Each structure stands twice: as C-alpha cells, then as structure tokens.
C-alpha cells in the first residue's frame, strides 16, 4: 500500500531523521520543484513529429530535478547523507540557450503553439519553485548549485519555448 | 451581474460573518483546493476513448473537493455552520489505489502520455493545496477529515496517473 | 547571453534600485501575475475553429497583465517611475462579463470543454495571484488599480468558461 497514513495529520518525512509539518520551507520547496517536474512531464507530452527534437533534454530537465529536490530535501548538516553538482547540468543548460538565442528571429508575452505555451508556463513555474527555494535558504543551509541551476532553468525555458515557436513556424507574442 | 466589487480593495467574506483578506491563511486553503478542483476539470477534459473509464470518478472527485473547500471556509467556532466526511470517501479512494496498483507493472518521474501526464500535476497541486490546508490548521481548528482526504488524493493521483499510462499502452518514465 | 547570474545568489533587481531577495513579496507578486500571464498564453493555444472569437481579447488581457506586471514592480515611492489605470479595461471587462452572463443557460464545477476547464484554470491562477498582490498591499503602498482588475478578472474568467462551454454546446459541470 502506497499510503502509509504516517501523512493524515500534516506532518512528514525528509531525507534523515527529521519529522517536518508539510507546510515547513523545506517541505515547500521540495513540493515546488515536484511540480515544476510534473508540468515538464506534461509539457513533454505535447510533443509531436515537429518537435520531436526538444524530447530528449526535457526527459533530461525531469532527471535534473528528481536530484534537486532529493538535496532540498537533505539537511546540511546532516551525517548520514549532497548529490547534485551544478556545473555540467548548468553548462549544458547554458549550450541550449545560446543555440536558440541565435537560431530564433518589444518584449516577449508568452504563447504561441501549444508546447511553446507550456514551455513559457514552465518557465513561470520554475520561478516560482525558485523563489521557494530561496525563502528556504534564508531559514537554513541549502545545496546552493541547486540554486544556479534553477535560476538558469527558467532561461532555458523562454529559449525553448521561442525555439518551439520557431520549429512551428509561429511568430513570438510581442508586447504592443 | 457577477462582480460585486466588494473585493476590490482585498477583503472578501468567507462562511459566516469574517470578513478577512484574500492572503488570510483560510482564504489561500480555500483557493488552493479551489485551483485543485479546476486542474481536475481540466484533466478531465483530456478523456478519449482509451481513457473514457476515468471520467466518473474524476467527475466525483470534483464533487468531493467543493466540499472540503466549503468546510475550509468554515470556521470550527462557528455557530450557525462541517458537511464532510473523510470515511466514505478516502476508503473509496484506498480501492482504486490498490485496484490500479496491482494492475500496473526505479523511482517513477511524472509524465508519459497527456491525460498521465495532468494526472501527475494533479499529484503535485494536490500537495501544494495539502501543505497550504496544514498552514491553516497550525493556526485555526480546521475539519481534519479534509486533511486525512486530501493527503490520500495525492496518492490516488498517483495511482490513476500510472493507470493512465498503462491504459493507452504507455511505460512509466524512470528516473535513470 | 540573456542569463547574467546576477541572480545565480538569489537576489534580484526590479524597478528602480532595490535588489530584493527572490522570495520578497513583491517580487512574488510580480511573479504570480507573470504565471498567469503564461497560463492565459497556453489557454489562447487551445482555441480551434469553434472558439476562435475568444482570441482577441486574451491576448488583450495578456498585454494589460504585462502592464499589471510593471507596476507591481514598481514600488510607490520611486521618484524616476505607475502606467497601469483600471478603468477602461475593468469596464470592458465588465461589458463581457455581461455580454457572456446573459448567452449562457446549482453551484458550477470548473471543467467542461478543454478551453472551458483552461479557462475555469485561468480564474483560479488569477485568484491565486490576486491573495499574492493582497500580501505586497499588506506591506507596501502599490498601484490600487492592479488590484481592482486583477479581482474583476477571475470574473471575467468564470464568465469566459461558460461561454467557451457554450460555444462548443457543452453544459456546465454541476455540484450535485
Ligand atoms: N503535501 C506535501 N507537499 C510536498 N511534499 C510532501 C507533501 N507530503 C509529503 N511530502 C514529501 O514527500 C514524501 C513522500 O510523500 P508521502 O505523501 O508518501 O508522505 P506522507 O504524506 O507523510 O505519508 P502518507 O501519504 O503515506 O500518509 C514525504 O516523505 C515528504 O518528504
Ligand atoms: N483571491 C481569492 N482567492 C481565493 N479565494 C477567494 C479570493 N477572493 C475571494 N475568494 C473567496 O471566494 C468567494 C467568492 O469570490 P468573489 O471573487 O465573488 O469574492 P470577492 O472578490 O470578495 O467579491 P467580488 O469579486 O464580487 O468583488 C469569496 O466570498 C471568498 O471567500
Ligand atoms: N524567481 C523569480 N520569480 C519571480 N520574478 C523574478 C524571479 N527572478 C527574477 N525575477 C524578476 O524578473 C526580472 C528578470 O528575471 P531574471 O531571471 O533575468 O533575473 P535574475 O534571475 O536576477 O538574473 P539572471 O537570471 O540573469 O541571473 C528580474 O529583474 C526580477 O525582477
Ligand atoms: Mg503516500
Ligand atoms: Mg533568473
Ligand atoms: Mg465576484
Ligand atoms: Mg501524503
Ligand atoms: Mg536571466
Ligand atoms: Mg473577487
């Protein structure tokens, strides 16, 4: 049985000892990046034959996340468990930037096709796991590369999202 | 006409007499249920013939949450209104758990095919609207069987999503 | 390069001088407005043949959210930067709200067609939002007409649903 009902009175588990209420910072920011991956699984859905291309770095994007939010849910100082390191996941992130940023054509508003749409909505829902994610590391020690990553995330997302624009040959929504 | 303006200056009433703000605790509990409700609508709405089997107890599901939003917006003091109880309902839920659970074949990342895929952020804005319901019950008595519900739905979500998967001949995304 | 890593800390700037940290109320409040914003942008994706009316004045609301955007950024007391007014686009909101109330047929359920549940999605992302724009009001002095679209929009939003639902000959869901 997947319900185990430790969880009916608000209370929970993290990675360690540590009893927390669900509503805990940590708890949160753990929750956000949760669904930052669910809405990337969904955005990933909605691929079809003409891109196709974005699949695999998406798939890639949902490994990514399942490491961030196992370190927001790991205590700093805790002795018995870090294991995400931001350098080749952000660089990479960093290529994919660069090459949409040159490939693609007033401010942007976000829409287009259906998964330039879900791409511009990731990149909204990464923000605001972000923003989590600092109000827990104001509180407590947290793996700050899980923090330059997401921060670059929500960039690559309006990249892609502009890519997905143009892979669909649709014009980006521009503020009149 | 619809629009009172009575909220135009960020107060809003709830069940009884509290006039509060809309970022008063009850009324984001309330909101975050309220946002629930609208992604299973529109998960709903992704239904096809494969998947036609999901449709009533999304449909009741729907039912369920208006009335955990009603008792949220209840204050336990007061004297002239709870109507929900968790037994029925959760154990309801516990049966599909375990049904779609034995049906279906890592750790499992959110996504696979559309209706899979929103089933997943189901889960997650599920637990977003759980840990928001654990913010006011740390502050206010709240009914407790929306807590005991609440935390069971994710793990439906969970269950249905996989199910989901299965019924249109999908794997399970793995973390790698 | 559109990534600096200025923010890579988890600091950032708005309007003016101020580099406040992420999870600042009022960088959430900007924030949530710009989540909405991105959902209103994946709902004008969903339109097809039958809703094709309701494009214009989504991605209307778009640019006015772009608006609503900047002045939630803008903190009051800034002596070089406020351009949103509410008035004509509240009152042609209300003009819709009307137009809508009056075409279309218990308590309603969000869901129904997929744009129809989207934009069921949208009234609740706005709600959302909107307890956020309250927290930045509770804080700091901001643009009180922000406010008063933000809260006549989730009405707009119930009142487009209805008649997305209408539009493709689809009932509203019912609380039975
Ligand atoms: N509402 C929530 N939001 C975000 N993260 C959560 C939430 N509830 C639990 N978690 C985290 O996810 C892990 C697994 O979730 P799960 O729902 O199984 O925990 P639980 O609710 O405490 O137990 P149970 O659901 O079996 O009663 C937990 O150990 C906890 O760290
Ligand atoms: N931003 C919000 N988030 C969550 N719940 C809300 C919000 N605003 C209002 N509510 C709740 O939903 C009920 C109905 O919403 P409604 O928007 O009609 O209220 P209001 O905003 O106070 O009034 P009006 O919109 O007519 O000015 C309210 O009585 C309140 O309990
Ligand atoms: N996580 C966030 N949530 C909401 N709003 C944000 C967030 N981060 C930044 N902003 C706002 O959006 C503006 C542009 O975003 P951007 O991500 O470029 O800022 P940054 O993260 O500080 O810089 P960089 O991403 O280049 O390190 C910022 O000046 C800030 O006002
Ligand atoms: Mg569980
Ligand atoms: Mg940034
Ligand atoms: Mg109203
Ligand atoms: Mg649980
Ligand atoms: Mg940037
Ligand atoms: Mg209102």
């Given at each position: 049985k997947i319900y185990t009902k430790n969880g009916d009175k608000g209370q929970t588990r993290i990675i360690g000892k540590q009893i927390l209420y669900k509503n805990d910072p940590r708890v949160a920011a753990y929750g956000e990046v949760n669904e930052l991956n669910s809405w990337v699984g969904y955005t990933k859905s909605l691929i079809n034959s003409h891109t196709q291309v974005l699949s695999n770095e998406l798939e890639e994007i949902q490994q990514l996340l399942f490491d961030c939010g196992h370190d927001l849910a790991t205590?700093?100082?805790?002795?018995?468990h870090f294991k995400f390191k931001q350098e080749q996941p952000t660089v990479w992130l960093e290529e994919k930037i660069d090459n949409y940023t040159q490939v693609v054509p007033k401010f942007i508003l976000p829409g287009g096709t259906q998964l330039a749409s879900a791409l511009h909505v990731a990149r909204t829902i990464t923000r605001r796991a972000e923003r989590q994610i600092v109000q827990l590391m104001r509180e407590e020690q947290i793996n700050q590369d899980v923090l330059i990553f997401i921060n670059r995330l929500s960039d690559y997302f309006f990249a892609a999202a502009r890519y997905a624009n143009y892979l669909e040959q649709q014009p980006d929504m521009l503020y009149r």
């Open positions: 205590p700093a100082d805790d002795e018995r």
